[PDB]
């Protein structure tokens, strides 16, 4: 009704329609701590919120007030709550509200209440029709907004909207193959639709992954993915693995190739294999290289793997 930002915006204390109420001030105790020095504005709006809340005045004017209170500190979950009460009580047009929250999110895509608030609305309306488009927009401004992705996964699961997400994933991966969120999303999707048991799928997936690897050999995501879909069933069940991997030694090498090999070797040992002795040696040598030369930042770990590799 009156923008927090209008040059013509104003103190509630100062308002004609807000004179029947006495502004309840914050009570931080006689001897404050971590006490914030609020702007006359911030204090104004909240002193009044304290009151309306305290009275539990479920009025239109209160409603409009939480808006101001939220803009002042969108992280204030209490206000976010009372607002939801007003929404139900005053019986407010929710789609209208959807738009509101939509704009707020655009503004603080990293706030926790805003996203939850939206999920509540969607729930209330049982209408996911706008979600995937909205989210995409936000992920369009920050392809890695944890909340957005989280929100998206909820909409997809709850309303079973799996059909075009892989396509989406492929789109984003084309934009930044290093986007771990997408790789994850990719796993989320396939594992909830077809699963990785499907030979064809499995093969498709690795093939693809082996590509991205053999394309950006120092991109760790691809590696963790390939390892991810594989390692749940045993790398060692995968013969050519070692080989093709072995081929990339001079052509697409990184500590990742080595770590992976060390990983294969591990499984090839868990399952027992001829030449194991040698295998163990080859493995231990890699451990040292990674530890001593190739990836020393985690030398503690790499040597620990060398020691474990000793007992088991």
């Amino acid at each position: 009704f009156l923008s927090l930002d209008s040059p013509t915006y104003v103190l509630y204390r100062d308002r004609a329609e807000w004179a029947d109420i006495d502004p309840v001030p914050q009570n931080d105790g006689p001897s404050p701590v971590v006490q914030i020095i609020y702007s006359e504005k911030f204090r104004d709006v909240y002193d009044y919120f304290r009151a309306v809340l305290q009275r539990d005045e479920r009025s239109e004017r209160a409603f409009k007030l939480t808006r101001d209170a939220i803009e002042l500190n969108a992280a204030n979950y209490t206000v976010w709550h009372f607002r939801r009460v007003l929404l139900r009580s005053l019986q407010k047009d929710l789609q209208e509200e959807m738009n509101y929250i939509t704009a707020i999110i655009e503004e603080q895509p990293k706030n926790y209440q805003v996203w939850h608030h939206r999920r509540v609305l969607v729930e209330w309306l049982k209408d996911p029709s706008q979600e995937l488009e909205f989210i995409a927009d936000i992920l369009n401004q920050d392809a890695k907004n944890y909340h957005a992705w989280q929100h998206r996964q909820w909409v997809i699961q709850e309303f079973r909207l799996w059909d075009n997400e892989l396509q989406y994933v492929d789109q984003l991966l084309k934009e930044d193959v290093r986007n771990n969120s997408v790789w994850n999303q990719r796993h989320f999707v396939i594992s909830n639709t077809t699963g990785y048991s499907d030979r064809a799928v499995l093969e498709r997936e690795v093939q693809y992954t082996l590509e991205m690897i053999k394309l950006v050999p120092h991109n760790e995501s691809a590696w963790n993915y390939l390892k991810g879909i594989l390692q749940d069933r045993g790398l060692s069940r995968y013969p050519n693995l070692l080989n093709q991997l072995l081929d990339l030694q001079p052509s697409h090498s990184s500590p990742y190739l080595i770590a992976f090999l060390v990983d294969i070797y591990e499984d090839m040992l868990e399952n027992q294999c001829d030449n194991k002795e040698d295998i163990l040696n080859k493995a231990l040598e890699l451990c040292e290289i990674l530890a001593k030369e190739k990836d020393t930042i985690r030398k503690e770990y790499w040597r620990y793997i060398g020691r474990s590799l000793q007992s088991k």
Partner: protein, 401 residues
């Protein structure tokens, strides 16, 4: 210094020539960091890593009393500011005047809800975050008074009020759900000794479902592995004594991969940037993982170090996350705040102190005055405060009903 060395310059980013928004940003930080590293060579001084303890102390000392309107954005996390500050000091081995502590006690009391738990400030609905903070705070103080502020009987009620059938908890009535809640609950419940037999029924299983293909743990099952959530998970499991509910192996490989080979610090998510705070959220997992593994009799475990470059991390923090005026920070360029102050320091300490039964190989970078007081890898408060608290509440009966 490990970082100032010439071969360390090979740990620089391999763009593969395929530049994406990610490469770009990473590369960006790397340069900003390089600069800080080469700070010494250009100026011709011997590098001397020092923790601006006094400057930090004056910063903290001040904030514990009042903050600028720049802090309005936190008006709902006051107990947190308490904790952060009250811990940093704690780590800095600084004093907590018997009067200031009281005020804190008194303030938190005002934050405490009649329904149990704590709110972000006086009159706010209870929330697990502030609750976790409040408690830790009170503990850090550790006095009959502080402890007596906590209404155990009500705490339980509250805790139960948020408990979900699938084992998770809400952060607050009508609130969201994610691992944070689990850790929050577990931490406060255990410390105060209010854990009933069914309180955390199935919680361990819920947390376990959060561990994904990355080996890491996410906010809720299905989500990307994340440092902040991973700590909550693990820590939570350690408290319930069920770490084994996870695949610790892959967990280990994930966290360890989170340390930046060139920067020395940690990243919250694969292919994300370094961030001081993760000095704790990520690095703290190792001490937790040590116990765990050692717990299932792991022989290959070190008796002197954590499974991460303690050196590098100390360097990063010391060289890159310290604010001249006082306070620590995300990374160079980023502003200072008590959150990062609280966690950079927490990370430092983690990096400076090792243990493993009776072993004690501390590693203090630069000026020995840089060493900090020790902190508990689960609660993130002085191990002595932890012990002190649990035992005090131990002599109280779990609120059975």
């Amino acid at each position: 210094l490990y970082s100032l060395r010439p071969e360390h310059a090979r740990e620089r980013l391999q763009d593969d020539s395929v530049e994406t928004v990610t490469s770009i940003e990473q590369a960006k930080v790397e340069e900003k960091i390089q600069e800080v590293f080469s700070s010494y060579k250009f100026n011709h001084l011997v590098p001397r890593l020092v923790l601006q303890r006094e400057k930090h102390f004056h910063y903290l000392k001040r904030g514990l009393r009042q903050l600028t309107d720049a802090y309005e954005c936190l008006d709902a996390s006051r107990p947190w500011l308490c904790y952060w500050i009250l811990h940093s000091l704690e780590l800095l081995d600084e004093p907590i005047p018997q009067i200031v502590a009281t005020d804190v006690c008194q303030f938190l009391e005002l934050c405490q809800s009649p329904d149990g738990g704590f709110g972000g400030g006086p009159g706010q609905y209870p929330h697990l975050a502030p609750t976790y903070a409040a408690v830790n705070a009170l503990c850090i103080i550790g006095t009959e008074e502080a402890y007596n502020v906590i209404n155990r009987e009500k705490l339980l009620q509250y805790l139960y009020s948020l408990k979900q059938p699938d084992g998770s908890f809400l952060m607050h009535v009508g609130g969201e759900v994610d691992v944070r809640s689990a850790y929050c609950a577990a931490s406060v419940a255990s410390l105060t000794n209010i854990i009933t037999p069914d309180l955390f029924e199935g919680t361990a299983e819920w947390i376990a479902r959060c561990q994904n293909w990355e080996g890491g743990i996410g906010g809720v099952p299905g989500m990307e592995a994340h440092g902040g959530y991973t700590f909550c998970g693990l820590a939570a499991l350690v408290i319930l004594k069920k770490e084994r509910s996870l695949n610790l192996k892959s967990l280990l490989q994930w966290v360890t991969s989170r340390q930046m080979r060139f920067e020395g610090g940690f990243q919250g998510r694969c292919n994300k940037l370094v961030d001081g705070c993760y000095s704790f959220w990520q690095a703290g997992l190792l001490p937790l993982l040590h116990r765990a593994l050692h717990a299932q009799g792991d022989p290959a475990l070190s008796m002197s170090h954590w499974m991460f470059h303690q050196q590098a991390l100390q360097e990063y923090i010391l060289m890159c996350c310290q604010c001249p005026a006082g306070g620590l920070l995300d990374k160079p360029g980023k502003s200072r705040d008590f959150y990062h102050t609280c966690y950079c320091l927490s990370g430092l300490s983690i990096a400076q102190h090792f243990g493993s039964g009776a072993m004690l190989h501390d590693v203090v970078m630069g000026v020995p005055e840089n060493v900090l007081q020790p902190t508990h890898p689960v609660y993130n408060i002085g191990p002595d405060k932890v012990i002190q608290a649990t035992t005090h509440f131990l002599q109280k009966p779990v609120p059975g009903f």
